[PDB]
Amino acid sequence: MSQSHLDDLFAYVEERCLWQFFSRTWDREENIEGVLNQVGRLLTGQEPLRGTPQERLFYADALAMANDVRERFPWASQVNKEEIEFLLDGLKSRLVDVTITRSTNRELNHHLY
Amino acid sequence: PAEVKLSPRDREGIINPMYDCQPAGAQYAGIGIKDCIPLVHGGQGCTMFVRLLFAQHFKENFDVASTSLHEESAVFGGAKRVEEGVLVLARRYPNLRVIPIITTCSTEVIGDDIEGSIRVCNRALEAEFPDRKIYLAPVHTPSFKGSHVTGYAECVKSVFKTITDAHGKGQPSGKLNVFPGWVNPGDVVLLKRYFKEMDVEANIYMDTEDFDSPMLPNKSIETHGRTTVEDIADSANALATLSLARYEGNTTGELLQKTFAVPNALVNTPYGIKNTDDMLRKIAEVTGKEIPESLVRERGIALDALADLAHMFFANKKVAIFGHPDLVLGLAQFCMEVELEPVLLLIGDDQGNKYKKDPRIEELKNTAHFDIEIVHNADLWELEKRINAGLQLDLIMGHSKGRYVAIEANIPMVRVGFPTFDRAGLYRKPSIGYQGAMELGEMIANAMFAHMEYTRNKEWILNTW
Amino acid sequence: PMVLLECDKDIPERQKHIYLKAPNEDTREFLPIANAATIPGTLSERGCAFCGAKLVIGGVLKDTIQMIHGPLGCAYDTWHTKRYPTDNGHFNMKYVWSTDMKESHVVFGGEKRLEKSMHEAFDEMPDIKRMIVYTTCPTALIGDDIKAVAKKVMKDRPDVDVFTVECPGFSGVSQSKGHHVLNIGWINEKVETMEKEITSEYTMNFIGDFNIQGDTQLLQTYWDRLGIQVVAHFTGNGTYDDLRCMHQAQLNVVNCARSSGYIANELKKRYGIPRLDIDSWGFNYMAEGIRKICAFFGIEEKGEELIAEEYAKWKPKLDWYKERLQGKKMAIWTGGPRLWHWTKSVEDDLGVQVVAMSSKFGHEEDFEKVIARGKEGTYYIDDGNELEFFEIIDLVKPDVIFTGPRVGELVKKLHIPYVNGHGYHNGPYMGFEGFVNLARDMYNAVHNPLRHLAAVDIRDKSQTTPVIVRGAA
Ligand code: CLF
């Protein structure tokens, strides 16, 4: 069901990934957007973006997640392109909520590194 | 042309320090007291690094707390960190009785009023714990003078002043006070046996025997000093004080003489045969008790063992020694008894004006047939540099932070003094007394024997010696 | 929920530092306070800011004088305490330097004492031309300007290069502040002050690995097999001058995001070098990390050849240990990052259940990571202290504790074995082989005849002395 699928993706990211836990708000936002846009491409058979060094790194992170999602979750090979996109938009929102909006990490907005 | 010369290190900086700073030595004094947790007033490293150092030497945990000086205290003063730290200790450790409050470079520079904080805490503790007495001893240990040797002596003196101030003079105990200095548990075990065999009652300050604690079926933790408040208070009532270490507790023996008329007898630290002989003669003098046959026998067994080694393996071999001043001077005398030649003695702190007056210097000047260089204010680079410039040594005696000098120079090395973390069980092996002299001589020989085998240097000779 | 331990009834502020993860909780409501002031008198495990700069990071370098401007204790205390070998005979571990500050320097200043010490150090070791100078508590308090002294020395001695760190032990609350001051000063002053030859199409820095028991040298066998040039290691088996070249890398691979994330973040800001966080401990983690690096460079096939070979070599041993370690309970009481690098890797690869974790100096960031990866029913402790450790042992009854040696020697009395979570027992512990080494030490620690023998009271008529049968992979 759509909420179960999203719960699967969210639990995977939380227990596996590090890119959502970078040092500052702006870096978390950049990574959530960048990695998950690539994940969507990879899970829907689209050509990944591999132009700039940053794009190539989002691809690298995304490839791990896309491969793990396809191995862990049978549904991820059954749902269609629009359903994958909708799930990943929901996942972006959830990740922003828990890693930025409602995080009590008091360093996230410090202007200097 | 036969010359014992004292000279200072010729560099302003240090490379490879021989000793730690004063607060580390104060901590060492305190951990030998039962129901004591020292409180080190300064930054956190001043505590944690020293707890690690004790774990390296003893392979045990000892409890020491920090006041956790942070940036606000550096601007406005740290008294509130002391006061909080004392109460947090008292509240969480109901059996705690003694807190030496040890200053550091930071808290000496900023001038926190330790005695004023102690008055605050004494009032607070008396109100909060009416049926408890906690002894707070102020220990002034700036790290920019002296060393852990001086810090040890200062802490012992302060704790004794604090506790004896509180209890004063009572009924004569008939006991000796004994300040062995900074020695291992094995040295304490040997001294207890000597006093038992001589039928002399004595308190050894501090009694660190149980630092070598068992792993017990009941999971009990026994890794504590055995010297109690009551033991320290009773020092006022002793027959006499025997101080074995000029730089490591004699000033407490003098304080007890000045304050309580307990006569202090300072003797050479009992490394080697003669120094042990003279210690036992002083004990006999002050107590009226005879030296027992059992100690004549232990002495004879030590001499028998050393006689298998001295002219065969030791004669004319050149030795460098580093460590605490009482240990260095005492081991130089031991070396001579067994025909070793201690040509380089390194003492690691700024106390040269005292060392120039040490009567053992003169005892060396009147006996050595080879030149001796005594470098004070020395670091361990002073040893390495001399070896690199051509000094030929057959043996090094010192603590484990000199290990790489010996390893790289391919010189055998016996681990003595503090800390000896790179060999197993040395804290349990006496170095003082007759059995200690024997154990030291046999470590020396066995280190030489292994070296002969690894280097193929007449290794076939180890058959019919 | 947050936990008020019985031993903290008189310091109840500690409850906001201790989380027991329970079913269905929103963990965002239960993040420990971290990186706050220490409570005096607690027997906190924390060290000082100077430690974080000199012992942890700067002192790892193989070719650099470590000039500690202060009294001799800070130097003594950071010597013979670390296990970071080099390929030049362990220069870094053999030596420590102090300005031997005395009372007269407190009164009149220490700058000339420092200057003289610095020239002496370069004179005594004429092959060494690089130095880091650190302040300590009292040299900070008296205001010695070590940067100005270093400037004069470099003017007077044009063949040396000197870096300075202001890191008195009272700064910050822990080692962490030392990490930060060193990282930011290095990127501001010394990065892009020279360049090296580029010999590969694929270049990276490895950031936040300090070569404990040879970890860095083990990982370097991977990079060499893959044909990746490492411009600089920050700082395992590293050189001062390699660190000056960091701007040249195409990619920054980060392991210790706590100590060294700062310089990765600034290298991205200033030079556009992307930051890739990995876990270089953990068997399946190491495979993920290699796959990410190889996907970034477009050398995927070379990555799969290396992974296949490493699995063939090491996975059977790893699985032997998993069979015997499955269900064992572990505690991790270390600095912070190893909590989140290890909790799920020991669970996945060894079947080990981490039941309690304590961080000396971690930030809220580190707690986000560990709680995300960690189990329900586990305790998560910020700035733990000794009495808390005993209470936690009574609550969770670990089979093994990964912690420092002193704490290991304490818990031995309770018949609990330890592995040195800082300096390792028989490392390295990073990489594929390293995780097998970790598993071996855990196995030999717990399945140890001495532990069983200690429990027997020979006076109990009813008791015999057992024999245990062990194994080897
Ligand atoms: S918290 Fe850290 S280790 Fe402590 S002093 Fe400060 S920088 Fe240094 Fe140094 S000399 Fe000894 S150990 Fe201290 S009392 Fe000073």
Ligand SMILES: [Mg+2]
């Ligand atoms: Mg989860």
Ligand SMILES: [Mg+2]
């Ligand atoms: Mg015989």
